[PDB]
Structure formats: C-alpha cells, structure tokens
Amino acid sequence: MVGGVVIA
Amino acid sequence: MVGGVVIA
C-alpha cells in the first residue's frame, strides 16, 4: 500500500 | 507500505 498526501 | 504526508 503506497499513499502520498500534500497540503500546500 | 510506503507513506508520505506534507503540510508546507
């Protein structure tokens, strides 16, 4: 499981 | 598993 999250 | 979170 490979997850990526950006708040910017 | 591979997890990344950015708040910037």
Question: Do A8 and B8 form a contact (C-beta atoms < 8 A)?
Answer: yes
Of A2, A3, A7, nearest to B7 by CB-CB distance is A7
Technique behind the model: X-ray
Resolution for this PDB entry, in angstroms: 1.9
d(CA A7, CA B3): 15
Angle at the Cα of A8 from the Cα atoms of A5 and B5, rounded to 5 degrees: 25
Give B8's strand partners.
none
Closest chain B CA to residue A2:
B2
Q: Under an 8 Å CB criterion, which residues of B touch A?
A: 1-8
Residues A6 and B3: their CA atoms lie apart, in Å, by 12
